[PDB]
Symmetry: C3
Subunit: 428 residues, 3 copies
């Protein structure tokens, strides 16, 4: 097993009772690493074997206020009336503001729909067909509608919190996998308890991301977005609604937007509509779960405290700590370093991209361990299994043609592998 | 007294002036947790008691450049002059640019204020009241003003750093509360010194936030904003000024903006003003201190290193570490586990929101300790005091009606509590 | 030789054979701090000296998808044709959309460039030079182009990862300097190995930054930007291209933009172009490296991964951890505390700014150590050398005139220093 215990002590704890007790500290346990502790009673040379393993440490999205986003399509129309016809009596009437409708539009329109209307001056003379010679009125409105009724629920991730899953193997052979309470001792067997002291992750300053979920396809995505109530043009949430029903038809009462998302000019007798709306569907496709951002792999979650869980691809970039309290027993450790040799089969993917290149490598390891791969461009560490298995790791490059040598290491035994491949650049 | 010492050692330290010394390691102490260390001399058979407690670990806003924002109101005006009247003598004069003013606007306008002017062509013939038939001139200006003179100071938080407040109890009973220097030993009494080794915090990737302060009400807020010199439309700082005085009237001499924050459409005989300005008063009211963002509660600070200090609601998400060096003394520990039972009195607030629901719980604790509450949807941990006291904890829910059971745990003694209440969804 | 070892233990390590081994834990080592370990054999007076030092811990930009940004300038043109001249036969022809070009534009236009065209009505009657009285047609196009051919490559930093550099001094005096792999033991000499357990940095929630590099000057900057494919107006990346070739002339096949970055006002016979494009050169100039953001100094990197390395100015805000495994040897430590006295020579710079004021201080230290400076306005810590040297440190103030007392400390020896200076406020 692995070298995980880095401190062992005999302590005198009191309440006035006082008992001599043993206490071991495991300060840095990466996921996949395993400690094997043996406890021997005074009378019997037999040892009880306890195994302590960090199965996984998940990053959980700590959400802010959620909102809904419709699949918006731009729309507009316009009608012109002479200076003595219709509502246009001596210019634009004062009541025709941004939420006004004209009876001369004749097109099917949602009176409760989200949009922006207005009155403006048009051509006047008889050369454009008006008895009056002064300029006329052009009643126009630009608005958005949601055909197909596609809706996403957007939840910005205000922060990310580690959630550990530990695996403890009893001397009886029973395996207990659970999310531990930090600082709370877990009684494993007679005289011995295990306490999870907390988690550490070396990745910091993660860019702002949001959980995006389509309400009737249930597909998940993770991408930047606006906070609830914000409408910065160019991001998901520029059009947002406070409920699913409001987003179904984009109603005024529940949705907000920036009216400049639809461009409208005013010609003599028509209007051209220029959609400036950012496609939420295109963002959901590009950022679809599973995805890799900032060296963190984000996938669908196996628990209920968040549908998305994250973890670094470099397995040594996140760690747990343990305290083992044992009384009436003597501690011994099972420790051996690992060895591994490797060959890389293919190197494909993209360079200077968010995902990073994909390096395929087959590797034989003497035991379950952690393999390290270090190039001049990037480094990573991943868990490997005993025997011969193939692995696909993510390494970043900044050039198209890759032909360099990198180092491979398990437990201090260093080897070399050959990366030969070609990478592409993604469009924006 | 809690279980905080996880390693104790006897060392041989030299300077060669070699001395045998003891050193205890406290690697993970949450705020509210407390260690009790007893030291006995080889001669005297009784102990001196030293108590080490992490009172608080505060997150301090590491500010970038600050700026000032006014309570801005959109505004514009326009006048139309025939081609042989007024300054319009030969169409729009080239000198009349974005900072030019017309003496015909007839408004008590601030000629030093931030805004944008311009001249455009209008209706020409006698059909719109001009003897000349060539097209007239429209002198217009869109600008922004600050009635009531309300100003906010905005300081973007480029990063957050932990600031620990530790509390040492001497055998004399004297309590010393101070912010320790990491790595600097603090002499407590004869032969013993304690050293703070640093702080750890698990919440990562916190969204960009800014300290916002009203200048003559002093009320604080924490919300997203532009950096200094940036003017993204839709966030605080779209209009920003380099001094309090320039923001009082929004002077062009010290303020910057995007002129598209105000839309102006030119029609004959008047112009309509489209306000696209984000209400800073609306943002500061919603994000008012105290506020809870991403599992962190931000409140007014008790020190002088910034007016806002943050801390995780789950107190086990932040921790400090100590080293205790003792010479000529034998270390013994006071350690006892806590038990608690509780009942939940009220469950109110919102769901799927930034702050989270509020769970009120009466709890009896056998000692100062940490209580854990784990539900199927969320989990938290909070400090409790000895005896019967009431607490208000924040738990997140994604549905309106809450009627479920959750687990309560102090020191590995688990009981159950029932949550009943109704929650509302926040509007954007 | 500082006090870095906080735990030493004797362990029984097995693989049926077992062996007794010593293991020392160094849980918190700041940059510049050094541990001195001495190993003696039971029957031998020969002592072997081992020095463990953290040279520095660097933050590395974990890059997202890269893109290219040109130095764009606004441009537009316009022509007007009477109702029966040119393409204007029956009003504006429908086949003239945003990507159309009129053959009557005088200046030569890049028909493959990025821009936006359109047809609009204008003055009609003989008062503006047309026989027909119906409104004429105005053919216009607003676009951007890249004179001088200046291009930047932008790489958003999705996250930051620490990268430690340690140096080990052998008993032979040899110094071995390398970036360690976390968890991999480094054999130093017979019976002793050193393992790096990981890095902790207390700075969290760092604002989103991007690496900006001019392709032909190689100058670097670090500033906020748009993600790849995003075009929020007001940030770097509002105009972005997927290749250096597309950015050389701002072609449409590879670049994207928001057409509202160029404003066009169509008047009777001319067109005026309004540029609201954010100057990238101004951002790269202001944010040029080396720069200080959020208490972290970002400088040109000395390694191969990334051109930029970050590190806290407060050296106690980042730390490494070591484990020393030694067999058949007894451990003894060399530990001396430091003393230092100092006086500040000059206090200049800005207040309420991202960089903070710069404080120059001459300081006499008895050894290599860490000096702490505590004011009521700010606190920092920096590495000092043995002897008398001058240091420049960054401390933050919120007022213009500084007249306050501050405290200096090395190894628990506290004195006082008197900062006096004047600071200025930066414009937006
Ligand atoms: C190695 O890992 C595999 C899969 O997790 C497991 O089945 C096997 O028992 C492990 N080997 C050990 C624990 O020796
Ligand atoms: C429990 O905490 C309170 C306030 O934090 C303190 O006054 C009291 O002395 C503590 N009880 C102990 C240390 O036994
Ligand atoms: C002090 O630091 C300097 C520079 O880091 C180094 O050259 C010198 O050897 C150090 N002194 C020691 C290790 O005693
Ligand atoms: Cl972080």
């Amino acid at each position: 097993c692995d070298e995980m215990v880095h401190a062992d002590s005999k302590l005198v704890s009191c309440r006035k009772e006082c008992v001599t007790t043993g206490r071991a500290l495991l300060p840095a346990v990466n996921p996949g690493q395993e400690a094997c502790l043996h406890f021997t009673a005074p009378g019997s040379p037999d040892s009880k074997c306890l195994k302590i393993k960090v199965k996984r440490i998940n990053l959980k999205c700590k959400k802010s206020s959620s909102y809904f986003v419709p699949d918006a399509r731009s729309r507009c129309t316009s009608v012109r009336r002479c200076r003595w016809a219709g509502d246009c009596q001596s210019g634009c009437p004062p009541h025709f503001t941004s939420n006004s409708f004209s009876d001369d539009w004749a097109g099917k329109m949602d009176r409760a729909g989200l949009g922006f209307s207005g009155c403006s001056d048009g051509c006047g003379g008889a050369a454009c067909g008006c008895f009056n010679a002064a300029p006329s009125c052009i009643f126009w409105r630009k608005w958005v509608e949601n055909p197909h009724g596609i809706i996403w629920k957007v939840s910005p991730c205000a922060a990310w919190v580690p959630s550990a899953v530990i695996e403890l193997t009893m001397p009886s052979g029973e395996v207990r996998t659970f999310h531990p309470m930090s600082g709370i001792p877990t009684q494993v067997f007679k005289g011995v308890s295990v306490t999870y002291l907390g988690s550490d992750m070396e990745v910091s300053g993660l860019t702002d991301l949001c959980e995006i979920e389509e309400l009737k396809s249930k597909k998940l995505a993770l991408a930047p977005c606006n906070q609830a109530g914000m409408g910065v043009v160019g991001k998901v949430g520029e059009i947002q609604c406070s409920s699913e029903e409001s987003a179904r038809t984009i109603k005024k009462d529940g949705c907000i937007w920036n009216a400049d998302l639809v461009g409208i000019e005013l010609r003599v007798d028509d209007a051209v509509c220029y959609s400036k709306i950012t496609s939420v569907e295109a963002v959901a496709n590009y950022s679809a779960i599973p995805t890799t951002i900032g060296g963190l792999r984000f996938e669908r979650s196996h628990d209920s405290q968040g549908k998305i869980s994250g973890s670094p691809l470099d397995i040594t970039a996140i760690r747990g700590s343990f305290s083992v309290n044992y009384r009436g027993l003597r501690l011994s450790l099972s420790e051996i370093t690992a060895t591994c040799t490797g060959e890389v089969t293919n190197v494909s993917g993209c360079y200077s991209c968010m995902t990073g290149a994909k390096v395929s490598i087959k590797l034989h390891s003497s035991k379950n361990s952690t393999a390290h791969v270090r190039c001049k461009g990037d480094e990573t560490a991943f868990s490997v299994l005993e025997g011969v298995h193939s692995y696909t790791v993510s390494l970043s490059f900044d050039h198209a043609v890759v032909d360099e040598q990198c180092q491979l290491n398990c437990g201090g035994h260093e080897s070399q592998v050959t990366l030969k491949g070609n990478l592409i650049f993604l469009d924006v």
